[model samples]
Target chain A: SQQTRVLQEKLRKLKEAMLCMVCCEEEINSTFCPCGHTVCCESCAAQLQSCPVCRSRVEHVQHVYLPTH
Target chain B: SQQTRVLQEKLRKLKEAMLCMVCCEEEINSTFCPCGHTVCCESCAAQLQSCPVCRSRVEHVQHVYLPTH
Candidate 1:
């Protein structure tokens, strides 16, 4: 039960990273570069040139690294 | 136990995506552009002009989107 609880807790944290911080409606499918924060979907990412969380300059919008199930 | 098994299974898959295919020595911290494969570190990525897996033209090396803990 202890291992089960720990696994459940870890999964929750991983899922938290998968959600869009801006819209809260889509999975994080892209990231703002240099800042390294994958906090939004491509549509949400398109709305800004800077990282929504880190406020760093985004030179590229990387649409990669989808979390494998 | 069932749910814990599923969660453990899923995390293993997620971690598999985080390893560099080229070196197998570093976490995959970057991706080859246009093709969108996050399969190597910045150093391993810099040694190539094309994606090692998909063989797509590497236009840019995106150093973003590390899997959050």
Candidate 2:
């Protein structure tokens, strides 16, 4: 139905941001860990004990925000 | 309707592919120009003369594909 197409397009446009693997959300700010992987947003990554991808200890993490809009 | 939910989920999964700005479609591969902006799929980028985002003449492009599935 055309309603489905409109709704799907809206959903897709809403999710234009890249997903954060940890929180599983399309948050603009992504965590850049020393392990060189973006596991989650700054809020969730702040609580991580280690990189979700690798077991490397987290010395520090950077919250890189993207401006796509 | 429950059918709508299933249909939306399947549509979402289908578009798990990132969008190509030029073609305006979800494509497996994306073009990364020297300016470092992804604007199109490989096939479309090959025929493109410049980056769609900045209108910069493209010297070289890297097609980066992410494995989220």
Candidate 3:
């Protein structure tokens, strides 16, 4: 029961982390390129030449996590 | 009963063969480049400077579909 509880808690955290408010995909990772466009994750960003939402050219990507509530 | 069973089998086979276009990745509400090298959402095509796959200059694009048998 304790193991199950811990696993559930971890899953909850992971779900929250992966949730993207923009695209609504669950693989949430923060990446902001030099062009100033932010996206959910690398895979989502790969499909973009410019930012999918903003049409800005992306020059770099960095992984970041949002502060948990 | 036999006719109904045969029709059911046919429907089952049709469902099995019904594969969505993998190139679109279920994001099919868009046009593909002339070279057939890349598929992009309608919004993406409007902002792209070049084809993502072939790097060809995308002068124009049109919607095309892969027919299923």
Candidate 4:
């Protein structure tokens, strides 16, 4: 019962946190270069040209899309 | 019987998901420069200064604290 209580609380936090802060989307689907950090979604990614991780010149972006629901 | 079974399966799936790829904290508490893509947590935000969605120089970051859950 105690373990169940903890699990429920953690689950709620996880849901609240995964939401993309920009659009409130449930997933991050974009990343940048030099820094090599992957975050943000496709809709958000198309609007940029630099990496937010280090403010480096983003030559390109890699979209790793997953059909996860 | 079918409704009960489906409900049980959906609940399990929902609980099983919501893991954060960037950090295990589950909270995406960071923002970016230019104020476009609001992803990444505070820990990840420190590693970046540009807007991942708009590639704008991160002049200052505004942290929006919330009470979710």
Best by TM-score, which number? 1
Candidate 4: Cα lDDT at A44: 72
TM-score of each: 0.78, 0.42, 0.30, 0.42
Per-model tally of clashing residue pairs? 0, 0, 1, 1
- TM per candidate, chain B: 0.71, 0.62, 0.45, 0.53
RMSD, model 1, all Cα superposed? 2.6
Compose the digit string of candidate 1's lDDT tens values, residues A36-65: 777788899999988877788888787875
Which whole-number lDDT from 0 to 100 does residue B10 have in model 3? 51
lDDT by residue for model 3 over B1-69, one digit each (tens)?
455555555544433332223333234223333443324545665676677656778765543221110
Give lDDT: candidate 4, residue A2: 56
Worst 10 residues of 2 chain A by lDDT: A60-69
Worst 10 residues of 4 chain B by lDDT: B60-69
Model 3 docking grade: incorrect
Candidate 2 off by > 4 Å: A1-69, B2-17, B24-28
Candidate 4 TM-score to native: 0.42
> DockQ scores for all the models shown?
0.58, 0.08, 0.02, 0.05
i-RMS for every candidate: 2.8, 7.4, 18.2, 10.5
- C-alpha positional error of residue A2 in candidate 1 after TM-score superposition, expressed in Å: 3.2
RMSD of each: 2.6, 7.7, 15.3, 11.8
Tens digits of per-residue lDDT, candidate 1, B24-57, equal 7777777688887877888999989988877889
lDDT of 2 by residue, B1-69 (tens): 665687687666546435565576646344334454554668877887777667878776554423231
Supply the DockQ value of model 4: 0.05
